[PDB]
Amino acid sequence: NLRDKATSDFVDSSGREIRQVDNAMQLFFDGITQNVNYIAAHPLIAGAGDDFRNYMGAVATAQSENDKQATELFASIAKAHPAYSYVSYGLINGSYIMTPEDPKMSNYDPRVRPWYKTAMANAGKTVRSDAYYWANDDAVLVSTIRAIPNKLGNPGGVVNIDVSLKQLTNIVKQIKLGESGYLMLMEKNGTVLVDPKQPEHNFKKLGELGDGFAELAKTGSGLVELTLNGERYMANVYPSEQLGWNFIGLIKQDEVMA
Amino acid sequence: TSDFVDSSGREIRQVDNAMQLFFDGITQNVNYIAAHPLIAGAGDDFRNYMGAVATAQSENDKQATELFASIAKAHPAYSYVSYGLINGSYIMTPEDPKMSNYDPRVRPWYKTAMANAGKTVRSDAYYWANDDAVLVSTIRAIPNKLGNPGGVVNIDVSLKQLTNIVKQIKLGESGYLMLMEKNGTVLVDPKQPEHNFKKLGELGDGFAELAKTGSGLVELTLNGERYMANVYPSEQLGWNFIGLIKQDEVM
Ligand code: PRO
Ligand code: PRO
Numbered sequence: 124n125l126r127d128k129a130t131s132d133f134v135d136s137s138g139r140e141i142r143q144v145d146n147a148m149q150l151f152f153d154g155i156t157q158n159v160n161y162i163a164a165h166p167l168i169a170g171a172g173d174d175f176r177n178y179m180g181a182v183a184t185a186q187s188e189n190d191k192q193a194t195e196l197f198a199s200i201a202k203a204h205p206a207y208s209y210v211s212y213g214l215i216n217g218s219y220i221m222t223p224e225d226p227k228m229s230n231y232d233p234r235v236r237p238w239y240k241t242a243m244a245n246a247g248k249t250v251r252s253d254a255y256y257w258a259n260d261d262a263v264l265v266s267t268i269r270a271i272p273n274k275l276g277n278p279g280g281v282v283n284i285d286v287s288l289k290q291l292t293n294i295v296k297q298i299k300l301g302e303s304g305y306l307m308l309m310e311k312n313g314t315v316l317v318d319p320k321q322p323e324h325n326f327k328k329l330g331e332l333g334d335g336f337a338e339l340a341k342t343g344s345g346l347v348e349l350t351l352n353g354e355r356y357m358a359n360v361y362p363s364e365q366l367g368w369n370f371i372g373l374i375k376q377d378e379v380m381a
Numbered sequence: 382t383s384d385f386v387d388s389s390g391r392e393i394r395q396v397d398n399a400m401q402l403f404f405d406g407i408t409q410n411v412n413y414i415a416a417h418p419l420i421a422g423a424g425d426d427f428r429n430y431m432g433a434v435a436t437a438q439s440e441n442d443k444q445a446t447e448l449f450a451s452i453a454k455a456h457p458a459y460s461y462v463s464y465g466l467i468n469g470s471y472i473m474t475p476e477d478p479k480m481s482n483y484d485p486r487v488r489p490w491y492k493t494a495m496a497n498a499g500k501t502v503r504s505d506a507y508y509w510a511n512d513d514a515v516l517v518s519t520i521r522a523i524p525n526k527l528g529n530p531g532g533v534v535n536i537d538v539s540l541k542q543l544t545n546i547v548k549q550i551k552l553g554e555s556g557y558l559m560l561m562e563k564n565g566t567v568l569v570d571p572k573q574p575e576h577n578f579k580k581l582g583e584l585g586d587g588f589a590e591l592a593k594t595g596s597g598l599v600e601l602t603l604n605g606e607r608y609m610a611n612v613y614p615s616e617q618l619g620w621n622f623i624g625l626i627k628q629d630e631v632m
C-alpha cells in the first residue's frame with residue numbers, strides 16, 4: 124500500500140514530466156522539419172541540375188555558380204541555427220552540397236549513406252533517420268531528411284539537416300527525477316541516444332549493455348523493478364509515438380521509498 | 382496541497398522549456414531573414430501603404446514578398462512574416478495589395494524592436510484590426526541601405542495559434558494551463574478562449590482571484606468548481622504559466 128503509493132507516485136510524476144519533455148523534443152524537431160521543407164521548395168534546390176560538385180573521387184569536380192549559390196544558401200541557414208551540425212543535399216548523380224563547406228572532401232557518395240536510403244524509402248515525406256556515425260568528424264548524428272524531385276529525376280535528391288547527439292543530451296540532461304533519478308532516450312531498435320549519467324552507453328544497443336541494462340530492453344511500456352549498476356532501481360518506460368523513440372525514467376528505489 | 386505545488390511545478394518547468402524551443406525556432410528564422418541579401422540590402426523601392434492606394438510594386442518588392450511567402454508556406458504556425466522600413470515602406474505575407482492607411486513605424490512590434498536594437502526580442506501581445514487578430518511578434522531592428530537601423534523584421538504568431546499549442550498540454554490527469562502576461566493580460570485560456578486578450582482581474586468569477594498572485598499556490602472556485610492553481614513565472618519568456626487542477630483530483 125505505502126510501497127504502492129510511493130511507486131505509483133513515481134510512475135505518475137515521471138510520466139507527467141516526460142510527456143512534457145516529449146512535447147519539447149517534438150517542437151524542436153518540428154522546426155527542423157519545417158526548415159527542410161523550406162529548403163526543398165527553394166529554386167536552387169527544387170530546380171537543381173547536373174552541375175553541383177561531385178566528391179566521389181580523389182578531387183572534387185569543378186564548382187559552378189549554382190553550386191556556389193546553393194552552398195551559400197545552406198551556409199546562411201546554418202549560421203542562423205547553431206544547433207544544426209550540417210545542412211546538405213545529395214543528388215542521384217552522386218553530387219552533394221554541404222555546410223560547413225569542405226571543398227577538399229574525397230571518396231564520398233551521398234547515395235550509399237543511411238540517411239539517403241531512408242529518405243528514398245519514404246519519398247515525398249520528411250522523416251528522421253536512425254542515428255548513424257560520421258567518421259570524418261567522429262560524430263553521431265540524427266538526420267531530418269526529405270527526398271524531392273529536381274531536374275535530374277523524380278526523386279532527384281535528398282535534403283538533410285543533421286543534429287548531433289550532443290543537442291539531444293542538452294534537452295534530456297536537464298531532467299532530474301528526485302535527487303538521484305535521470306532520463307535515458309533510446310530508439311525503438313534499442314540504440315541508446317542519450318544516457319546522461321553514463322555517456323559511454325551512447326550509440327550502443329541497450330540489450331548489449333552490462334550491469335542490468337539488458338533487462339530494460341525487454342519492456343515496451345510502464346514500470347519495471349530491476350537491479351541496475353549494483354543497486355535497486357525502478358524504471359518507467361515511456362514510448363513517444365511521434366518521435367519513434369522511448370524515454371526511460373530511472374530512479375533508485377531508496378529514493379522512492381523515502 | 383504543498384505536493385501539488387511541487388508536482389505541478391516540475392511539469393510546468395518542462396512546458397516552459399517546450400515553449401522556449403518553439404519560440405527559439407522563430408527567433409532563429411528572424412535572424413535568418415535579417416541577414417538575407419534582399420532584406421539586409423533593401424533600399425527605397427518597396428511599396429508604401431500609407432495612403433489610400435499602395436504605391437507601385439517594384440521587382441525587389443516582388444522578390445522580397447516571394448521570399449516571405451516561401452518561408453510562411455513552410456511554417457504554418459506563422460501568421461505573418463513582414464518587414465517595415467524607416468521610410469514607411471513595408472513587405473508582408475500574406476500579401477494584401479489593397480491595404481491602405483498603414484504605416485509600420487507606428488506599430489508596437491516596430492517600436493519594440495527599435496527600443497531593443499542589437500537584440501531579437503518578442504513583443505507584448507497586440508491587436509491587428511484588419512484581420513481581428515491578436516499577435517505576438519518576434520522582431521529585430523536591422524541595418525539596410527536606408528540607415529542603421531533601417532527597418533524591422535517581424536514573424537507574427539497569433540493567440541489562436543498559441544491556443545492551439547497550449548490546448549494540447551495536459552497537467553496532472555485532467556488539468557490545464559493558462560498563459561498570462563505579467564500585467565494581467567490573458568494570452569491563452571484554452572478552455573474559454575473568449576478570455577484571450579482580456580484582463581484577468583476583469584473576468585470576475587474566480588479569475589479575479591488569480592489576478593493578485595505573482596507566484597505560487599492559489600485556492601479558488603473557478604466556474605463553480607473548487608480548483609488549485611500554481612502561478613509559475615517564466616524568466617525567459619517573461620510570462621506566467623498558471624497550472625490549474627481541480628481540487629477533487631488533487632485529493
Ligand atoms: O554522414 C553524412 O553522409 C553527412 C555528411 C556530413 C554529415 N552527414
Ligand atoms: O499588425 C501589424 O502591424 C502587422 C501587419 C500584419 C500583422 N502584423
Ligand SMILES: [Cl-]
Nearest residue numbers: 515539540541
Ligand atoms: Cl488571434
